[PDB]
């Protein structure tokens, strides 16, 4: 049994956000909804499909029928930006199941495209029998980004480490991604590329040995 949630929803303040939780015969189950902010533990915002817990604004409303449960947040405020999880009990497996989670983005400023800076491994690091590619991403909004690395036109997922976006002094976001290689890996390929995808657009930079 699996609950399907859209990975992300974006709205402007004052608009209404709708987060779906797809599951077979989920209308027969009682759905609870959790809100989690960064530096928050999960908090109940909807219980029993549509009931409103204590202290939760009436803007938070849920519904459930058929194969879809929906969390509806009216008059969205900036404080509503969070990850939302639907939860269900699957009696056939005796498992509590969470949805994959939906990140609700509240758009508080116009979109800003990322600036990507890619550094090759230094000669000094190679002499230490290591090689690190540094991909620096800055000046983007919203603060959600996905990084992919390639080599000679081929995906690379081993050795990739990416930070989550963090706010800059100018209130845009920044992030960084590192690719750890051996000296031979770096020296054997044409080139490596850092591919940064943001809001349906991608910026790719490429470096090559010597």
């Amino acid at each position: 049994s699996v609950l399907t949630q859209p990975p992300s929803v974006s709205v402007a303040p004052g608009q209404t956000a709708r987060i779906t939780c797809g599951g077979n015969d989920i209308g027969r189950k009682s759905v609870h909804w959790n809100q989690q902010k960064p530096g928050q533990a999960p908090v109940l915002v909807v219980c029993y499909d549509s009931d409103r817990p204590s202290g939760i604004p009436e803007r938070f409303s849920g519904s459930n029928s058929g194969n879809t449960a929906t969390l509806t947040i009216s008059r969205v405020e900036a404080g509503d930006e969070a990850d939302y999880y639907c939860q269900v009990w699957d009696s056939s497996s005796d498992h509590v199941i969470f949805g994959g989670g939906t990140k609700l983005t509240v758009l508080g400023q116009p979109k800003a495209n990322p600036t990507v800076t890619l550094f090759p491994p230094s000669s000094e690091e190679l002499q230490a029998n290591k090689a690190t590619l540094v991909c620096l991403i800055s000046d983007f909004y919203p603060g959600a980004v996905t990084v992919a690395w390639k080599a000679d036109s081929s995906p690379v997922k081993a050795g990739v480490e990416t930070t989550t976006p963090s706010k800059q002094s100018n209130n845009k976001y920044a992030a960084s991604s590192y690719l750890s290689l051996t000296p031979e890996q770096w020296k054997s390929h044409r080139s490596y590329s850092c591919q940064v995808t943001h809001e349906g657009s991608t910026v790719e930079k490429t470096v090559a040995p010597t």
Partner: protein, 227 residues
Amino acid sequence: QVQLVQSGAEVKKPGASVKVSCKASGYTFTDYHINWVRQAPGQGLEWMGWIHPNSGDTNYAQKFQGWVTMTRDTAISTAYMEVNGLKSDDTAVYYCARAGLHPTTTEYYYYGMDVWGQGTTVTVSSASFKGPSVFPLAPSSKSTSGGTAALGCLVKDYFPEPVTVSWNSGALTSGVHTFPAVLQSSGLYSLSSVVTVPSSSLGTQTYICNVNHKPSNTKVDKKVEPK
């Protein structure tokens, strides 16, 4: 009020075991299930199981049965989660949660979670206290405005946080961008700091990043040349 008080952050080496606690207050401990949920960094919530403090009955999730153990001590209103054979992919925040959402029908006889603990961070790593290696990020102008260049310093594989970086002993602050550290599978941290400077100045002016890692008593003043 109803609260669950969880134990503090843990740093474990691979292969070890860890036992985190969840103490109830503001309600009767034996009245509700305690559920356990873990969340790897940047991932979603992952249900591990529940225990009923009254009977001690357990319900282990498929993914966690056999290598975790849920227990409880009703005398001190505390539940425990023990994770064995720790691996790097066991790095997560481990939550406990009270099952205060009683069922409304005997059709769907399930007690759902209402109040959550604040979580216990467990980081599994071969990491010890370690000073960083500092490497130069030689100047390039491919992603900066016209007539300017970006150069930097890679501060690699240190533990624990923090590392502070200045430039030319504080004389250089304008156009400095120090990115927050990444935490890697090794459990070691790495960060980068870049400064955007005039291209003409590369022959005239010396650029030094001043790296300070107090927890290991390491300082490096790395000069960054155009190469």
